[PDB]
Amino acid sequence: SGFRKMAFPSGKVEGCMVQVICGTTTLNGLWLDDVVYCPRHVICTSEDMLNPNYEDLLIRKSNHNFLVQAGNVQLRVIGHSMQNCVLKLKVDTANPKTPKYKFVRIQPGQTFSVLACYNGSPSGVYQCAMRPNFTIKGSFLNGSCGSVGFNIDYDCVSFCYMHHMELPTGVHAGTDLEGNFYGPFVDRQTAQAAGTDTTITVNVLAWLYAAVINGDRWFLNRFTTTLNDFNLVAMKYNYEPLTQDHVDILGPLSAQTGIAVLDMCASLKELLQNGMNGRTILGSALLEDEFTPFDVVRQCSGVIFQ
Amino acid sequence: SGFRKMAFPSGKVEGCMVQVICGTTTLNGLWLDDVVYCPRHVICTSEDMLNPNYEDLLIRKSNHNFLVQAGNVQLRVIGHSMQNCVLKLKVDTANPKTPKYKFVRIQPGQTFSVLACYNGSPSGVYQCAMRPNFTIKGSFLNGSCGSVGFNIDYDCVSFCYMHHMELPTGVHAGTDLEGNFYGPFVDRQTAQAAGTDTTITVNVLAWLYAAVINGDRWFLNRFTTTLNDFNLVAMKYNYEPLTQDHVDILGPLSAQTGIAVLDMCASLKELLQNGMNGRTILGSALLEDEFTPFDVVRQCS
């Protein structure tokens, strides 16, 4: 009953948030076992960031230079090392709250929850999607660096994102928890451009299935379309071309609603050319692409008449 | 930068979530200290909730019927009770993960985070607004009865909502943590009239400031207007009348941007009158009333 953009419960991730201080720089860290993971730019100063030699700057830093706070308790840094763009600080105490975890690399189109933190304190949680241009449309401010993205699958927390920087366009950039950036970005103060952002069509189709499940059918029409002649409209409107694996992923939602995938593609084609003409789908005046088919199934779980 | 609908970190509330069972009925409970709060219809089954007598059903039940579970560990009931529409079950074990909390009753227009739960297990966290007609734009499935709505102030979790019934008409009904329903709803499964829904004007004007702070300012005009003139336009589009108390709250937002309260009213008046004609504000092609001035300040400060 109802459809909302929902984040995963953040509890398991809050128990891991710590504050990391290095000289004049303060950001957030993720305490898993006796290792703290944080953006490696923490070892820099604004001047360093113009062209930082992270290897040379990491030589000059010692275990004493890193101040880690888990609430009011201080943690002893007994070792340090760098892995791509992430700094790994080995602490003396293991985090008793370390959940069952794994470092995963999500694909563009996929969603995750973000826990925004300031000075090692959780502030809020929101659901995000990895845009096809490898940026996120988030809400982060000074001190948010080190804030993580994650999904929860049963008892396991899959960490997939760590916030590093904001791009001139207002969008955000970061790495997986192995330090590897998503997209063509670098942790260096240089002119950077996000790229062209296409709309995630598989997600838009999923959202239209969620709208039908919640009683919105004005957009449904007698017309049908082919996969090939839909991708032609998708080229004009900057929508991703629909692959066969994506059509199959929409199988369960198609089977439930009894609307064939290409009949939903015809409705999508019509909304692109003619527009919504004042009407709203799920109370939104625009087509939403930030819900994966799995997110729709998670809330719009219904029966299938085979 | 960027403006997102954010929910409060739900960790302090996840530690309070237990699975409450009574008869062949299973919902969620909120375990705070040695008391577990849950919707009183936990005593009822799929055949009692048409029009039941909750007073005579509470007499018929003893502490052996109620089985409170906190995950792997089981809780034993040491005294059932009832305040308004909520059921308070006393327990032997006090909740070790009980955070500093308070029970509040939110007013229409105010927001809170909902932690959705199924069989005592948390599923997702989303931010809701209490509509003027006392309804919530929620997402709840079966077994979500007893899911709570809250606000987090530093360490203090203010619990303001408990999910009771999903109306046949669609919308969701619930009480405060004292058991008093929000609006004209009862714990009986029947078609109940939600009411007339106005747009929360104070929340739209706060959202217009959030857009200005985040670089969106095409909607801004040189023009200005008085309360009496704006309140006339407010009636035409189903918008809440702007009170003088509504003006005082928007002060810090106005100070941060430079645009005075009455100046932003003149932009809203024009946006309602002409529309947007292709353009969007904060990535939305519609005006947003789900963000209080405090929610906008929370993110943009």
Residue numbers in the entry:
A (entry chain A): 1 to 306
B (entry chain B): 1 to 301
Study text:
Severe acute respiratory syndrome coronavirus 2 (SARS-CoV-2) encodes a main protease (Mpro, nsp5, 3CLpro) that is essential for virus replication. Mpro cleaves coronavirus polyprotein 1a and 1ab at 11 junctions with a conserved Gln residue at the P1 site, a feature with no known human analogs. The essential function in coronavirus replication, together with the absence of closely related homologs in humans, identifies Mpro as an attractive antiviral drug target.
The crystal structures of the Mpro mutants with the greatest reductions in susceptibility to nirmatrelvir were determined in the presence or absence of nirmatrelvir, including S144A, A173V, A173V+T304I, T21I+S144A+T304I, T21I+T304I, and L50F+T304I. The T304I mutation alone reduced nirmatrelvir susceptibility by 3.4-fold, while addition of T21I, L50F, or T135I each slightly further reduced nirmatrelvir sensitivity, resulting in 3.8- to 7.9-fold reduced susceptibilities. The double-mutant enzymes T21I+T304I, L50F+T304I, and T135I+T304I either had no impact on Ki or had a lower fold change, consistent with the lower fold resistance of the corresponding mutant viruses against nirmatrelvir in culture.
